[PDB]
Symmetry: D3
Subunit: 252 residues, 6 copies
Amino acid sequence: ADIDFRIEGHVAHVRLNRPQGLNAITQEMDDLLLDAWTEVNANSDIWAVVLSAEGEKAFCIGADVAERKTRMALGGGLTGIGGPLVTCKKPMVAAVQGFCVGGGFELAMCADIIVAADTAQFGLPETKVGIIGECGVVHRAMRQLPYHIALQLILTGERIKADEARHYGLVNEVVPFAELEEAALRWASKLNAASPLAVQAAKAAALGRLGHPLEVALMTRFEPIEEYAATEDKKEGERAAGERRKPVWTGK
Amino acid sequence: ADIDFRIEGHVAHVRLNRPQGLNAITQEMDDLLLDAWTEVNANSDIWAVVLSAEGEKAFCIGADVAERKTRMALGGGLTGIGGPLVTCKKPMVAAVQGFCVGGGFELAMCADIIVAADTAQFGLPETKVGIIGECGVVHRAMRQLPYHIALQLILTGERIKADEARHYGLVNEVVPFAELEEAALRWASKLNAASPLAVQAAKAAALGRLGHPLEVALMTRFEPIEEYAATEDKKEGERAAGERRKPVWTGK
Amino acid sequence: ADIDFRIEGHVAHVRLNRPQGLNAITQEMDDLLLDAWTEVNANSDIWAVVLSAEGEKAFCIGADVAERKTRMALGGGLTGIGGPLVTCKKPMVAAVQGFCVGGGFELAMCADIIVAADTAQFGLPETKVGIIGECGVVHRAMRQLPYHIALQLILTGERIKADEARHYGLVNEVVPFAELEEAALRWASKLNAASPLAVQAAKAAALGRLGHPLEVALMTRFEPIEEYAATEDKKEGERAAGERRKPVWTGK
Amino acid sequence: FQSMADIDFRIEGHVAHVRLNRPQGLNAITQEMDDLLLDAWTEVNANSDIWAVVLSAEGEKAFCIGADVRKTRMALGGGLTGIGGPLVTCKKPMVAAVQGFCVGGGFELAMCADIIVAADTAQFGLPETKVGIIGECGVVHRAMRQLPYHIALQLILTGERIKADEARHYGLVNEVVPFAELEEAALRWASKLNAASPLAVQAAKAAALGRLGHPLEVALMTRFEPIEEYAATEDKKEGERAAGERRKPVWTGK
Amino acid sequence: FQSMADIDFRIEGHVAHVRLNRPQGLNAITQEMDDLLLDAWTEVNANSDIWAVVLSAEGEKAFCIGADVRKTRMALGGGLTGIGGPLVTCKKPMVAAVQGFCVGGGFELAMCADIIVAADTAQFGLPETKVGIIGECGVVHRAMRQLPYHIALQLILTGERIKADEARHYGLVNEVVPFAELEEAALRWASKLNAASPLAVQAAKAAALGRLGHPLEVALMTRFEPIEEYAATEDKKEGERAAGERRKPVWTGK
Amino acid sequence: FQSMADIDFRIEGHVAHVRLNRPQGLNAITQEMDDLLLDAWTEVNANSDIWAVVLSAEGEKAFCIGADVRKTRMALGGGLTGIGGPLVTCKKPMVAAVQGFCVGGGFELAMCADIIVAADTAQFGLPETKVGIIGECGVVHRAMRQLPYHIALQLILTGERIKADEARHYGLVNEVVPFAELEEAALRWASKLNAASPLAVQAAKAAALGRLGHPLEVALMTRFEPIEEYAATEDKKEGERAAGERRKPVWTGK
């Protein structure tokens, strides 16, 4: 299948699996990705997602260039470009090798944490090839890179390498290709060593008020945070601190 | 007293002084901090604030874990988390050693300029210990660090060191611990070598429209800037330039 | 003339030409700059602008310190400070040598791409000399530099050098002064090797929703992007990809 | 089990009837009723045979007086008010048929409807301040958006009621009728909504409300997915065909 | 060439008259008419002799029924509605004089005016949902801002019309007159606008509308360039002089 | 010294009376009066015995005609309008009692109130454009938020007045009474406000107005500190006790 989806303990692996097309996303892959995000959001055993891709040449080069009765945003909904935005409420680590361009770059930018192989190259080549539609593949770059660096990518369509991405904090870690799966899994293990409902709430709060004035943010009541107060994990955090031991999270 | 507050010339020193609890903020310290911010805002002899902390182990590890008739946001109001937001209108330099975590990190992030000892470590361990409430301690990190680095802190609860903070421009300067007080004072001296009402106005304008579209910002009338036109310092800036001499500011 | 304006192929050169006043912008230069931006926006042969300045000492030190019947924002409108904001819809490269301060820094920050000579120094000395009016020269720095670095500039009025600007991604490239014109032209050549109407649309979309929540951005319909669908260049991009050849853009 | 009929839900043709049915408590919403309402809104949103909803209530004394004086957060009205828990949006057009007392959370609930028909016995109010209760975001925000500023404040701050005629005068309600005519009047409205193209009605509702508190220029430059999707529907083609052949369209909701 | 008179444009003193003049299509706006309207708004905005605009329409049956059932995007009404293309703002105060049917894009166009005078034959509506059409941002956003919430939704969702008296009742229209009196009533309004200081009127309009969907605190701290520029005008001085000498000001529009 | 009585301020029980008292200038607000008003609002906000304010004015001709034709910026009305200087918010509920001319900055000031009772002599307007004055953010923003769009524009752009009956019709005013009954009518309103739980009233006002120009979804997810603080008050307990014992609550404002 062109998307490989597996649940291993509390980690869901969503893996692009069409290396013969440099993992360009077909309409069928978008269907399978949408099924994955739905399951990821609905299943309380899934605490984190690793988004990855098969092969060495490319994580993802964007959409595969007819024709659908429903609007589907690129990445099974996840980009919100071309259709309704789907939000993945679990923390996500993207493991990126090789080319990560256009819609593929946008997709990686939907992740929370990004670990790149030292072969990774990021870019937005749409202007350079003369394509632009919908809202543009430009809004995440403006929020995740320094202003003039984002504009450089968006307007020239030239790529930047893993080291430069790391330098600006677009990516959290750069490793040799051989170490990419293990590195991604170390990050998922860190995310799942924290209280998973608290991690989810923190993500929802951070991102849900990111483009608002700070004062508006600070006065926001976020439902996942409200609901955390009634959880077993919340009680487990107090018990464990009171008994000077490590908490054991259950995800409820 | 657990907060030490002193006015020396045109600098107010607000110093956390409970090193035996790694400067965790008690309800009493929050009262004393609120008194400090009130005096800082109301006294025209105070042109800048240095926020610092006693001991080597930690600037501040957040709130000390009953129970109050009024809502008090952490840091005598300054964070706006847990109660009404108090804004310090004078420019503030935070001098941070050792651990700076949770609410302590948020508090440092309320400062304008941050100077860190090379022992400083910044983090938001709330998710990792299973605590989250109110709006979350997440909104300043999203505004003061690159997107994926902020998310790394918020979601894994792991710390970053002074050198990495400096690298991203979270901190303005890193010095040896022995040099921290003097470095903080150099920054307060720079702030007070500029026209102090103009500095205050600039801070109010920059921050008062920070999460708005640029066009909205550029069309804003800010009362401190309007009021600057009628000051003696404003006339002193023109006189001094006209007579090719250094201006002598009076703060009126 | 104190602004030198030339069209060479698809690049417009807008050059400040009053080196005897360190390119401080007079009311007459503001008139000439406004004429330039009007022509730049209206002429479909102009695909990119290089904003530059004569002499080695300074790109621009801001406004020249009576008195006009109309409000004119600094830089022929381009800053939107002191009058209506004029938007340059073509991609702009600023080539900055020497001092780039106050209104001159703000003006450079209106460009998309900034190439600096290794002599460049950026700063906002208004607070330090005791001047502040209108909305303040503070809003672009908050959007183009890390929060605490922006505040350092705004509040102390001290300069940063080309290497530090590059480090944070305020500037895209630093070169020796002798290489500045050629470097700026390499960037204009990259911008014009991409489809120029698509570049313009991408710029309008990125910047038109920059201070909005991401969800608002992603749901925006941008007229330049809508209009791109009906262009000859848009068809030329498909033809060229279909025939495995380089596209030849015509700007229509 | 004893509560399982405190919300009456029935689908008749293309209209869903969601009826509050605990008149003994003046239709104050219990936790059980919030569960049933959440089931109703889920079904209303998911079922493409449902083109409009009539929200109504049993008895003559009251449409709804609010919450009845849980470990999951549930906003009042099975999610619909968004007060006390996540906001649930009903994407189908809704007519509220209101008799007697419509107060507090009950009034907020009626205000979630698109069209409101009131019996001439209806009295609307927000008594929370007057009885000394206030929590969450306050039951104040819809009033500020659906009445003139000073009238909204009067309700919010005094906690006194207004009558049906005054509500109609300010265009808080669309029609006032005798209590005997209320069900039938609500059904006339639902028939009007369902005589229009139902997916277009939905898309218009999503657009109108989705940009309501934004600047007009932002609203005008919004792309709304239900509008984009409408271009690919059978009803969109049927509209053109019917106009081209000077006949009444026959909508199929697809 | 055959369309060149489908918009009648004339300047009389300080009033520009922009008159839709294709009554045979019930003043549905063709592509040619959109071109002529865009020319009109350009001239209206650029010419300092024009202090106010009356937007009107020929015939008794209809002010405008919308778009007539191109490679540049043109918003309906020569840009003025901002629906289908870039928004064109008319900076001069505008009076719409509306008779008969004022529906769809036609109603949206009237809503772009500042003052609306209606003949007692006027009927306002948004029939798009009812005929099964919806595109772009929807013709819904101005209704939500110019009518009470539930009345706006009634129009938007049912596609049924309201009459002049009901429009006047909610303050959608400023005056209702007999059809014979419509031109003259519109001119009384334009005379009132032009008896005030015209650059101040413009600046007030730009301020009011430029911050309309923002929080009040944001609005109050806005600097509006037309207001800043007004301080340097002759009319500003003439206002002070006239008040100082207890006489009527004579405005020159400079 | 000669101005020290141009604002009359008195506290009677839980009502503060802030009365403009320079009828010889038709209660145009001088710089001295702005100082006294700022003192009043400071006391009103700080004193927990004050639960409501009645803002009124001496004489029959005019409530207030605006600013009287300084090195600190002072917004008109001791800060209250936020026009010309920092905005001062009165956190206690306010009733404005308006007679005669209520124009310009005077009208803006009345619009800062929550409830407005007008004598049948009241005339409201914004004559700034008509006399050729406009500065700062414009005296236009509250009108756009408190009247129907086209009625607000009519006032703003023509500078002509409307009468009390028309203001009441659109719900700009809450009640119209004969001039002889004005003080007593204003006091009935203040009694209604103070019969509700005063800290809850305050908190409702802060919530309603604090999110008024934001999208509804933003409003609904707002945490308001006066609401959070209300949970810890004696009045909150007294409300529960009184409801539990089927008796009238006795509020203490703590």
